[PDB]
Structure formats: structure tokens, C-alpha cells
Symmetry: D2
Subunit: 505 residues, 4 copies
């Protein structure tokens, strides 16, 4: 007999596990428990802080919710108007000395005319081919070139996506991008070129909300806090080390054994296989591909420079900087960095020089959060990546050589991106059914490994829907039909359903 027995056990308290727990807590039927090896819940949706007081998410984290259930839980966790800040979705592509508004193709009027001619010629070729196309694209690369044509593909989406995924676009599938036909909007593109016009895909209606305090990590701490504490076990005491699927028993770090009837696992599925000591599953999960994420943070003295302005996140297709994305993290909340009256010495200038004085001086401060990818096809020198990132900030004119840096941050995250390779689905449809046969619901960004449902809201709902399937026979729609859930606002499931309404009466 185990030390503890529950109907449903949940491993992990990132957004996916917390979803499972929130739904179980709402249903309040079967018994349950959630564990995590970190005392702080949140997973990759967590937030670090430097000794100088600059917060950093795990790279750019911007919420767009497809589900009212997700909204209900965030509202419950952070219910006050000044728990949040609202911003427009402002993004740009760095190209040939210019900040080009996203989407790139609608804004190539900013490039030299001779280059515009090449882009348009290429997209004309694609428009004519699309008019007679009778096959689907088979790779990410084919999808890109059929949407954009050669010239525009080569300027942004091809080199950018290699810097992100750390594998060539010819090695990835394209089903994950959804059901839309790969074909250009030639009229929209030539119209903006003719008018010499620029236009972003944002406005008063295209917004996101970010937490006032604690970074993205503030959300999940708050969400976790709504659960009954005694059904949680976070920290070293909550670290899973063994999973015996045949006896339906988990063993924790300190030796505690937990019996379950159903298991929701949200740790990386390659880690789960190892914990199960299942050679077959180990082999299979080693054939999944993923990239690692280096997060670099830079804290800068001074008020926000005009050239940065209201920018939120930024794309970097070119080879003069190692990062694929930059976020102006100080624009997300004034509490993501110290207040203007806090005093910090300058650590270095952006060109690498020593400051004239080592004395602590006042702010205000602004802040840049950078992402660099790593894989077996794309090594990252961990001892120089910070300095390379800062040199990249100068090359891209985000920072002047004279800008004063008062804080630095670097951390590597082993499982960063689950890669939509050509082989992914072939491998996943061997792994997930075997786990399912053992009453194990392996779910989440690395729990079920599908990037197209890999954001916070997807993850949270993968947990929720996993519980709903276990208990109420719900379809796991987010897991099996990404296009379905991403193409609609999912409104039916709420934090208060009829069941709880009728029971209370």
C-alpha cells in the first residue's frame, strides 16, 4: 500500500498541470493531488529576477487566449484593474538598417526599390503558380515560398525560422500552421508598395494584457494560490523520480509513494519515459526533436529612447546578431525593472568599455529581453553568448555604444521548443497511444509536444480537457484538433458550469 492514494494524480504545476488542478478542484468529485519539483509553480511561464531588480520571463511571453475558461481563471487569480496593463500588439522585423512593421510583406516599401522589384517579381511567380496548384505543401519551406515567393521568403521567414527552430525549414512539416491555403495576397502587397505606405497588424482592438507585478510568473503563482494547499506538494518534496506504470505508483525524491487510478503527466515526455524505466518508450521519445532556449536580459540606464518607442517584440532574420527575437520588457510593466529613484552603478557600456565612474547613479531604467536558440545542429557558446548578444544590440542599433548597462541576465533552458519536424507525428502516434493504454494522459508543451497548441492558454486547457476526458468523457480537442480550437473562441466551458450551479441549490 502506497503512502498516499488519489483518484487522479497530476505531475507538474506549470500552466498545464494547474489547468488539470483547477478543473479537478471545480468538479470536486474524484480525489486528486498535484506535485512539482519547484517550490514555485509556473514552469516555463515563470519569471526570474536579477540581483539589481530586473525581472525576466522565459523569453517573450504574450498572452492571446482562445478560451473563456482560461480568462475566468486569470480573472479569479488577478481580479483588480491594476493587476494588469493593456498594450497593443506592436512588432517589427529588423532588416537592412530598418525597423519594418509586421507583417513583413505588407511593408517592403521601406526597402530599396531594386529590391522591391525582386520581391514583387517573386510573389507574382507565386500567385500564378497558386492559381493552378493542385497539391498541398509538404514542408515548412514549401509553405513559405508558396505564400511569399522566393525574394520575400529569403529576406525574412527562411533565415528567421532557422534562427528560431535551429533546424532548416526544409526539415519541418507545415500542417501545424493550419488550414489556410499557401498563396500570396499579391494585391495587398503591390498596393502598399505603390502607395509607399506602411501598416502594422495592430490597432486599438489588437491588444494583450500583461501582469502589473511578478512578470508572467505572477499569474501562475496567483492561480496556484486558489487551490487547497494540502492537495499540493511543491519543492524537493514534490520531485518525481520513479513512475511504475504497471502498479500505478509514483515515487518521489524523499521516498514518498503515491497510488493513482489516472495519471496526468505534464513533464517532458522524454523525461517521463526515463522515469518509467520503459526502454521502448525511451527509444521512441529520443526520436522527438527539440531546441534549447538561452534567455539573455539587459538592463539599461536612461528613459526609453525615441528609436525604441512603443515597440513590444522584434524579429531578427539577419546574421549580425545571434538572437532571433527581442522584447522591450520594460514596456510591458513599469514594475519589470527598478523605479527611477533606485541607484545602480554602471556595469559596462554597450561597446564593452568600463564606465567613467563606478558610483551608483539613479535611473530611470529600460530593459531588453533576448532569445537565442540551441540544438545539436546549432551550438551555443555559453561563455560568450552574453557579450555576443550585447554586440548584437549595437549592430542592430537597439543600443548605442555609449548606452550604460546596469544589469545582465543569462539562463539556459534545456527544453525550450518542441520542433514540428517532418517525423514528429509519426513518432507521437506511437508514444501517446501506449501511454494512454496505461491510463496516462501525457499533456502539455513537452507533455504532448505540439507547438501549434503550445502557448499558455493551450497548455492550461490541455490540462483542463485531460481532466474533463477522464471524468466526463469530453473530447480532447486542443490535443487532437489544433485548427478547431485555434479557429474559434471556445466559450462553452466556464469556471462555473451548470453542475456547480445546480449542486449549490
Amino acid at each position: 500500500h502506497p503512502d498516499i492514494s488519489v483518484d487522479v494524480l497530476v505531475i507538474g504545476a506549470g500552466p498545464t498541470g494547474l489547468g488539470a488542478a483547477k478543473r479537478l478542484n471545480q468538479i470536486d468529485g474524484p480525489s486528486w493531488m498535484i506535485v512539482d519539483s519547484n517550490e514555485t509553480p509556473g514552469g516555463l511561464a515563470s519569471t526570474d529576477v536579477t540581483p539589481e531588480g530586473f525581472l525576466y520571463d522565459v523569453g517573450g511571453h504574450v498572452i492571446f487566449s482562445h478560451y473563456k475558461y482560461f480568462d475566468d481563471c486569470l480573472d479569479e487569480a488577478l481580479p483588480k484593474e491594476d493587476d494588469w496593463y493593456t498594450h497593443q500588439r506592436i512588432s517589427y522585423v529588423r532588416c537592412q538598417g530598418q525597423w519594418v512593421p509586421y507583417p513583413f510583406q505588407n511593408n517592403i516599401s521601406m526597402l530599396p526599390k531594386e529590391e522591391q522589384v525582386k520581391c514583387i517579381d517573386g510573389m507574382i511567380d507565386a500567385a500564378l503558380e497558386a492559381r493552378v496548384a493542385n497539391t498541398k505543401p509538404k514542408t515548412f519551406d514549401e509553405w513559405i515560398v508558396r505564400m511569399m515567393g522566393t525574394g520575400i521568403a529569403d529576406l525574412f521567414m527562411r533565415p528567421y525560422n532557422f534562427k528560431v527552430w535551429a533546424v532548416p525549414t526544409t526539415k519541418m512539416q507545415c500542417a501545424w500552421l493550419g488550414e489556410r491555403v499557401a498563396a500570396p495576397n499579391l494585391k495587398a502587397v503591390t498596393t502598399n508598395v505603390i502607395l509607399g505606405k506602411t501598416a502594422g497588424n495592430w490597432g486599438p482592438a489588437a491588444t494583450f494584457r500583461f501582469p502589473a507585478r511578478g512578470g508572467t510568473g505572477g499569474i501562475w503563482i496567483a492561480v496556484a494560490n486558489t487551490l487547497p494547499k494540502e492537495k499540493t506538494r511543491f519543492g524537493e518534496k514534490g520531485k518525481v523520480t520513479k513512475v511504475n506504470a504497471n502498479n500505478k505508483t509514483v515515487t518521489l525524491q524523499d521516498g514518498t509513494t503515491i497510488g493513482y487510478k489516472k495519471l496526468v503527466s505534464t513533464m517532458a515526455v522524454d523525461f517521463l519515459a526515463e522515469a518509467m524505466n520503459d526502454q521502448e518508450l525511451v527509444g521512441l521519445t529520443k526520436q522527438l526533436f527539440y531546441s534549447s532556449t538561452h534567455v539573455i536580459g539587459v538592463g539599461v540606464r536612461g528613459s526609453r529612447p525615441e528609436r525604441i518607442g512603443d515597440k513590444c517584440w522584434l524579429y531578427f532574420p539577419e546574421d549580425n546578431c545571434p538572437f532571433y527575437r527581442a522584447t522591450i520588457f520594460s514596456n510591458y510593466s513599469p514594475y519589470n525593472q527598478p523605479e527611477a529613484s533606485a541607484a545602480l552603478p554602471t556595469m559596462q557600456l554597450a561597446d564593452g568599455s568600463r564606465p567613467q565612474s563606478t558610483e551608483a547613479k539613479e535611473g530611470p531604467y529600460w530593459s531588453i529581453m533576448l532569445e537565442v536558440s540551441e540544438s545539436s545542429m546549432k551550438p551555443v557558446n555559453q561563455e560568450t553568448i552574453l557579450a555576443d548578444c550585447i554586440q548584437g544590440l549595437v549592430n542592430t542599433e537597439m543600443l548605442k555604444p555609449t548606452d550604460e548597462i546596469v544589469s545582465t541576465y543569462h539562463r539556459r533552458f534545456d527544453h525550450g521548443y518542441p520542433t514540428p519536424t517532418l517525423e514528429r507525428e509519426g513518432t507521437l502516434t506511437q508514444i501517446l497511444p501506449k501511454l494512454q493504454d496505461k491510463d496516462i494522459w501525457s499533456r502539455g508543451r513537452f507533455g504532448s509536444w505540439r507547438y501549434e497548441v503550445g502557448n499558455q492558454d493551450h497548455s492550461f486547457m490541455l490540462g483542463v480537457e485531460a481532466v474533463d476526458n477522464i471524468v466526463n468523457g469530453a473530447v480532447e480537442l486542443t490535443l487532437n484538433y489544433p485548427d478547431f480550437v485555434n479557429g474559434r473562441q471556445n466559450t462553452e466551458r466556464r469556471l462555473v458550469d451548470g453542475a456547480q450551479v445546480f449542486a449549490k441549490s
Copy 2:
């Protein structure tokens, strides 16, 4: 205060209402009640019997189930292996003196060669147009021609569907048919013509099961029987005459008042609007179109003729019979008609003449079930329709002139088919949301009026999902996404879900 109060009231005990009842009963949370004006549950999925002992469904009723939940409930209701007979899905098209195996286009090698040339020429045109098509078909007719070409369209799907729907194909939408591209399989059609080959779309894996006893109506009687009798009200005592949606109060014909929190209404939505005395809903539901079905039954003396054989249902595009479909109902079950030893006089010969002898004689017997449609665009002489059907049977060689008819049946069902007109959706998205804002779930064949989810399993699940939405916040997938539910095996929802297992412990 009303005579009765329940959380969920279900109106109608056809398959939809029974689905709602079955799921409410399983969940065993909210209080509930189901009413029907008829003492016998089943609705359009019921069965009549003639005074001579011949059973007739409301036209050809063949079950193909898309859902594990539906299967669970039929199995619980009729658990014994001898409660069912299994048959292959054998159908033919009657055309120019021949029985042509369905699908029609794969079997035109049976037609005269000059006619095959015309067919293939038409399908070649359609193939070539499909190759460069970039628009979706907008009408049922357009869809048919794109799929078949003119020649084949004119032989079967065009005149057949007029006889079914009682409106021109040019007046119907085609979205209801699914997401498949409207284009011919030219190679498969020409291959069978070249090989001189015929092939039906059936075999040992393409089967259906039919109840041993009581016809299709036997299923819904037995399903209803598993419900707690005190929560049912079937007969004159259960006829709904008035719905007060603002008071959430229903009044029955005997004066009984029932108050509700949520209403699942499965009566025809035009009848619901009338009962609500809601003039705006009345005006809207009169914009919907439907056809009536005439069901004609013919009982015949003799063992099953060789020319008929194992045929199950049959399609009639041509003008020499008024019916669009025939069913060899005596093939579906031995107990659909009297035993051989039963003595019955001959009523008439199939050519209309009086029999030589008026004496009761023995069998065996077989049985034909016919459907004739009617609408404002296609009137039907009710006084001659029986004699016309029987002459139709002689014209199509189903009956010899000398065949002895021992039983006849005719019944008109006013709401027979909800028509997929071009206007259907524009109307329904005014009706269904307006009802739902009043907490009324109007569902089913005429509850929500969508033929493409209009069979017995669909109807049952519309009831189930409505309840699942009311209680567990489930997506009503069958209602809003026909293509989704019809395109997969729906296995997640069962008659015993985790909820009931964990609670029983």
C-alpha cells in the same frame, strides 16, 4: 408556484429527447423530467403495424452509428445477440430496366455503350474544369455537376433528389454535404467502364444491425424502459400546449404546470414558436422549409422472389414510379411480417384486379416499404397515392401483375425532411441563438432542422450534448460542426464515464 419544478425539462421522447433523458439520468445531478404527447416513445423512429400483422417503420431506417455513446445505450436496451439481425448495406439504383449497384457512377458499364460515351464525355468536361477550379459550388445542383458531369448527373442524382427533397436541386445549398472537393474520380469511373466491371460499396465490413422485434420502434421503447418511470410523462397527460419562456413555465394539455431552469425542446421548432405565442419566432420559423413523407407498405404472398434477393434499399430516379426509395422490409427481420402459417385472404392482385379466390390462405410473406415526398412545390394526390405506388411496383418489375397483395398501409407524416434550402442557415442563426438566450435548447431533426446531422444517432447525441453543455460546459459538436462528428469515430463519451466510476467507490 407550478405543479412541478425541475432543473431540466425535456420535451419530446423521440431519439433526441431520450438522449437528453439518458444523459441526465447517467449524470444523476440536476433534477429532470421528460414529456411526450404520444404514449409510445420513438417519434419518427417508431413503428406501425397493419391489422394483418405487417410492420412498417417511418420509411427506410438503417442505422449507421458515429458514436460510442449511442452504441452503449442500444446495447444496454437490447443486450442479447438475438435482439438483432445483421445485414450487409446492399443498395441499387433502378435505371432503364436494370438494377444498378450503388454508387451509380461506378456501375454505368451496365448501360448501353452509346450512353456510356455520353457519361464519360460529361465527366471528362467536369474533370478538366475541376483542374482549374478556384471557387466552391454554391448550390446542390452545381455540386452534383462538378462531381459527376452533366450526363451522369441527369441519369441519377438530379431527378432522384427532386423526388426526395420535393424542391429543385438549384434551390438547395451544398455545404451540408461536407468539406470534400466537388470533383470527379474520372479514373475510377473509366476503369470500371473499360473493365466492364460492376461493384457495390458493400461487403462483410459494411453492415448494419436491425432489431429482431418491434421494428426500429423497438429500440426506443427499450431505451425508454431503462429510465425511472416516475420522471416520464407519456401520452395525453404529457402533451405540451403552452410555453411561457419568460416565466420558464410549461403548461400541459391536462392543465399541469411545470417550471424549469433549462429547457431541452425536441418538438419541431415551428411548433415550439406557436406554443410560446412568440410572434417573432413564428414569423422566423415559417421561413424554414420542410417536406412531408408518405409511407406506403405492401404485404405480398410468396417466398422472397429471386429477382429481389438480398436487396435492402433501392433508389428510383425515373418517372415510372412516384416513390424515391423502396425498402425490402421483410429482409431486415423475419418478425417484420407474419409467419408462413398465418392465414390471410388476398386483397388485390398487383395489377389492381380482384383475386379469383377470397379465401384466407397461408404464406410465407414478404414486404415492401415505399417513400413518397410532398411539398408546396410538389403536390401529391393522397387519394390515388396507394394505387399509384402499387402500379409503380409493377412498372419497376418489383412485383409481377399476378402477385398477391395481402396487406396495404399508408400514412402521411407532415414533418418528414428538414430541407437544406439556400435560406436555411440565415434563418436558423436568428432562431437558435434567440431561443438559447432564453435558456431553451431546441435540438433534433426538426428541433434544430439540420438533415446532415438528422439520423437516429445524430438526434440522440444532440440531446446528450445539449445536456452535457447545460451541465458540464461541453461543446455542442453535432449541432455546430456536422463535418467534425461525421468525420471521426466519437469514442470519448460513454454510458459509464470516470465520474460514475469514481463516485461508486
Copy 3:
């Protein structure tokens, strides 16, 4: 017996008839003569002069030669270097206050940006349609819109060609435009828009030569002068009034009869049918369609204005002037108008006012020649068209209100353009073979009625090839295959062939 007998009689001494005569004269075998009702040869390629000394052609006449034979005869007729002036082929379209270089679609960068978007959008549609086109256009209008797209078609070729042809573009065929596929060069057009480029289709290699003296009419006076005079009969003495095809006899105005074996007739074929008293042919030729040409000439005081510059001919699609084409006739030769020291009073100002002063002032002078079409579908008010033309010159900014007009000219030419209507070919194939079977070679701009071979070189060669067919069994390539002769350099036939070289020894 007739007064005169020849082997080959030629009617008409415009370029077609003169071509016949030159080749007959070179071959020097069969006897021949040529007649014309005009004392001066040249037909529609003649030149008028006003009492004030301004020359006008019959509208703008620019030579482009497809044949060495034509070149040899012009060189012979006018052998000196100063018999000719050479110019680049410079033309513009007047549109929205601008002189847009021809071809229009490569120069729309001059229009407002919003016009450019409409133009490119329309051409994108036409490009995408051309990609799947598998039928030839059936009308001139279809050809235009398939070539240019709606927006560009509407700005120039559609309204311009109505003003030229005096019939809707929808009523004309398009085979006459040659064999090139009706499809846009989208890339060339967008490239010039993107780059802000204009470029005319002329330069040092695209030139024409114009006679130094006597206008275009000087060429045919001089060609006719190389013929033996006694074989010509020009003037009232040479006016044909009767053709008796059965007797092979022609009757002249003065009673002279001419017997012939073969007749080359270059008068308008409808006039030929009348002269023949052949009611059947008159009936057929009345089914052909043609437009009349009003030529308006305007002599202006002043040195050539900068705004005019080196322009040669100009197109006018807009409805702010009656004329379809303007020619800067003073640019073609300094002897097309009087020398600077010639004294002329101002007749009127361009604004329409007439000055009191009769003072004769000096020059220099320049000159504008205008063309307006007329047909039974497009009446022209003869009494006001001069004044309307002049106001048109002011609206298009060719003349200033205050410019001084010292000479005016207006003449209406009944047969101006042979129209390539939809019916033309059908009618010609009933006419031309019938004349052929009577040994009548009816040829020329209205002799055989085909505009695509209706220029001076074409006309000359229809004469030449007609004689070559009669004598040497030559293929009449220009008559039956306009695409053949227009698509190559015709160099084989010369004014001195081998026959004449070998004979000389």
C-alpha cells in the same frame, strides 16, 4: 472591238494601283495601262495645301516599311539625301493633364498613386485569368481587357478605339491584331511603377523618313513619274463609270472602252459592285462597314512651343476633344508650312475670338493636323467640327487661348477606314473569290478592305503581288496572310530581280 485592248488593266493610281503598275513595268511582258479619275496620283496618300501655304496629309501618315521592294521604289522615286527627313517614332497619350509616353501601360507611373493601384489591380486579375485561359478572345474588346486589365483598358485603349473606329470595340473582331497571346506583361508594368520609370518605345533605332517636299503626296507623284506616260490616263479622261465583267470591258466617263484579260481594281469594292451593275455584289458589299475621316488642319504663328517639342503624333482617349489623333505636321518637314519671313494676318485666336487688325505679320509657323471619325453610329456636325477641334486643342493644352491661328483646313473623306467588324471576313469570302472567278483582282485598302494590311507599303505590295500572281503564279501573301508579311522582313522581291539581270546580257 473596244477602243483600247491590254492584257492587264489597272484601275486606280493610289499606292496599290501604282504598285501593280511598277511591277508590270519592271516585268515588261504583258501589255498594260493604268487609269485614275484624279489628275494627281496618290489617293488617300495624297497631300492638300491651304491658300496660306500649309500642307496637310489625309491625317497622320508615317511610313513603316515591311518590304525591300517598296523601299527600292521610294529610293528610285526620291534618290537624294535631302529628299527626306528622318525622325524618331515619338508618340504620347493625353491623359489627366499629362503627356504619357506610348505604350501607355509602361508609363502609368505618371498617373496619381490611386490610379496606379486600380491599374495594377486590374492587370493582376488579367494575369491570373491568362494563366488558365484556353480560348482565344472573340472580340476586340475581349482582346483589350485580357491584354491590359479593366483599369488600364478603361483609361486608354477602350475609349480611344471607339473614337478611332466609330463603332464599339465589342462589335469588332481581333484576329487582325495578329497571333500574340492576349495576356499582360505584369512584371514589366509593375517594375516601371515600382521604380518610378517612364520609357517610350522609340530611340535611335526606331525611326521613320518623311518627304522633304510635297508631303506624303510627293512620293506617289514621283513614283508615278517613273512610269511610261502613254500607259497612264489620269483625270476626267480616266474615270471609270462602267465595268462589264462578262465582256471584260471597262467604260470611261468620256465613252472610251477598254478590253482587258485581267483586271486589277483598286477602287473601293462597294463602288466596283455599282460600276459592275451587279445587284448581288452590291448587296454583299453593303454588308461591309467603314468610317469616314475628317481631317482638320491648324496653322499657328510662333516658333515651336517647348510643351510641344519633338512630339510626332498624339493619342486622345478623353472626351474633352473630338479628335482621336493629332500630328505635329510641322515637325515632319520645314516645307510643310511657310518660311518665317512669309507674312500672314491672324485669322483667329485659339479661344475663338477674331481680332480687328488685318496686319500681316511674319512667322515662324508651326502646324497641327487632326483626325475625327464618322460613321452611321457616330455622326459629326460638319458645320462646327473645326471650332470644336480648336477648342479641343485648348482643353488638351496644345494651344494657349492667345495663340494666333493663321490657317485652317477641313476635308471629309468618305471611305477613310475599312472596319474589322465581326462580320467582315464572312462577307469578304463571299465577295473576293466571286470577283476572282471573273479574273478581277480587287485589292487595296478598300479594294480588299483589310486594315491590318492597309498602310502604304501593304497597299503598294497588294498591287505588286496581284501582278506577280497574274504573271508569275506568286502567292498573294499580303492579302491572305497579313501575319506572315508583318512578322518578317520581306527582302526577296526587288525592283531589279534576276530576270532583268540575265535579260540585260
Copy 4:
């Protein structure tokens, strides 16, 4: 000073040179002379006879005339009705034990059904590709596949043409095949298959005429006889050995020198280059490709076998025989072989056996003429080719093993076919203008090397047109525009033109 001087010298008295001579004789202007190394005119259009009395053309020679001038000369040469025999153009393709009527694709109903399926599927692919094609085929092979589809291409045109040209279809151009779009008549092919029909492209309208006597060579002996004998020089006395283009002098084998002003040369242009001792021209003409032709004749005892019937020529794609084409030469004229009373011994049986008796026995007789190609890519064993051909006759069921052979014939012709290789035009457009610059018209099947105008009528007219250019400035249409002359009835040029009519009056 040369031994003889003429204005126009003609080398060669095959059909081309005889064309030039006939036109010079008609014109009767410039002095001329024609020479040949052979005493008998005809070239490759000559005829041999075996010592047993069987005639053989140089392979299958069937006249289809595109020109009235050609007909005039043939009529003049053989004016009597019984100088000619008329036959329908009956041809078949030998394939898989069947005689399949030409054209192959319209008669694949004779193949096994399973093969008809593969054939039709292939053509369905080709039809669908044709609907969206926007390129012209660039090789003979691409042309074949676009016309026929893979399956039909593989059965006939691909293997047959390798057997004809002795080069692969991927190495030849396709322009020579004309302007028709490379695309299938899918409806024509599927129609005959569905109907089970065979039909050839012949009937009462599709005929050819063949000389009663002397074979095809009889035509050219008779044409040559119409020339003034003294302007001819045929035999060893007429053999050209040197051409001195700079001096315009030809030297003959007997030492005779002839001066000329223009040279029409109809010998193979590679031999011409040698005779000119021009090394640049020798190099260039060595880059032309050509195949040799082996002609095999077999005389057979017996009346015409039923299985042979009215067959004229036959195509052999398959690998069980070395010949690509057979001709039933005995069907063309009864004088192509001895009369029935002529007595001959049997040389061998068709399987190679000795006859039972060596006695001369009577006929009747029939006769087979075979063609086998040779090149550097396809050697021919001259010592075994007769026997291989005879075995091929048995393999193809043209001869029974018991059939008695009474005469055999074999002869190799070095220049047989001029090959339309990919390189042909690039070479010829370097050779022909250089010869032209020296007043040398090189013309004919190997004079100008173009197969698409390489028939008797083409060749004859190449010579006619060359003279017409030399004397009258005619366009050499047949040389430069094969599609033009082959696509029309060329009726204008006659043996009696107007020039000769007018001179005689």
C-alpha cells in the same frame, strides 16, 4: 575561260534538281544546265529491279502532294489514266500479336483490357496537364508524352521512332512536327474504347496514286524526258568533283569545267562542302547528323494471303524484328513483280529451309519491302540483315514458315534520313547563309537537310522555288516555312503561268 557557261547550273537530278530544271525550262529566260553522276534520274526516288523481276523503291514511297505545280508536272509526265493506280492510305501498327489500325491511340480497343486501363489513365494525366500547360515541349520525347500519355507513348511512338531515327527521342527537336498543341484527344480515344471500335484514318477521300510501271522511279524518268536533252548531262560525264565558289566554276570527273552565275546544288551538303574544299564548311557540315537506310526486298510465291489483304505500309515498334517499316509493294502495282505465268524456282522457305524441289514453278507472286535504319548509335550487320529481316517476317506473322521465297534484295543507302536533332537548326543557320553569300542555293532532302519538307513534292518544289527566287524574287516558302506550305493547298504556281500565256499571244 570555262568549257561551258550557263546562267544557272543545277547539280543533281533527283526530284529537287528536276524541280529547278522544270521551272527553268518553263520560264525559258536565263540559260541553264543540269548534271548528275547517274545516267538514270530519280536519286532516292529511283527504283531497282532484282534479276527475278521484282522492283523495289528506296523503301516505302507514297506520294502526298501539297502543290498544284507538282501535280501539273506529274500529269504532264504520265498523262494517261492507266499510267497510274489509286489506293487508299491503309496503314497499321504491329503490336502484341495484333494489326492495329493507324492512328494507334484510336484503336487500343484491340489490346487487353488491363492495358487499355493503363493507357487511358496515362492519357487522363496528359489531358489534365495540358489544361494548365504554359510551355512548349522542347524535345520530340516531351511532345510524344504530352500528346499520348506515358502508356500509349511507350507502346508505339517512343520505341518506333528510336527504330526509325536510330537516335533517342530525347535527343531530337519537335518544331519540325508543326504548330499543333501537344495535347491528347481524350474523348476520341475513350470513345473508341467504350464502343469497342477500330477505325483507320483512311477511306475513299484518303488516297494516293502510284505509277503503273517502273515504280516511283518511273515518274522521274518521265519528267526528265520533258527536258531538252542537250541541257542535260547524266552519267560519269556528269559527276561533279570540284566546286570553286570564288571563281563560280564547277569541274566534272572527265575534266569539263562549267562556269555559272548562280548555283543550285542538290547533292548532300556535306559532300558539297568537300567538293568546295572549304574547311570551315566541312567542319560545320560534319556536325549534321543523319541515318543510313537498308532496303530489303522479299519476293514470295502465292496469291496475296488473306491476313495481308489490302494493307499498304506497316509500322513495327516491337523488338522481334529489325525493320521499322514494311510495304506490301505488290499492292501498289501488279507490274512491281512478275506475272503469274512467269516461272521461278524457290530459293528458300521463310524459316530458312531448302525447298523440296528446285524446279522453276509458276506464280502468282507478291512482294514485301522492308526498311532498317543505321547510325553510329545503331550498327547494322550487313552480312546477316537479310536473314534477320526474313526471321522478322515470320515473327510478325507476315510470312508462314512454309512460305516460298523466290527473290531477295538488299541495298544500303548512305544518306537515308536527315535527322531533326536538337542541334540541327543551330548548324544549318550557319551553313546555309554562307553558301548563300556565294550565290549557292543548296536545296533538297540532303541539300537543305530538313525532313519535315523532305518528301518528293517538297523536294521538287524546293528546286522550283529556288529558281523562282533566282529569277522572279519569289519567297522560298518551302525552305523557310515548312508549317506554312504543309498547312495549305499551294495552288497559285502552275506549269503554265500568265507569263507563258501572254507571250504566246
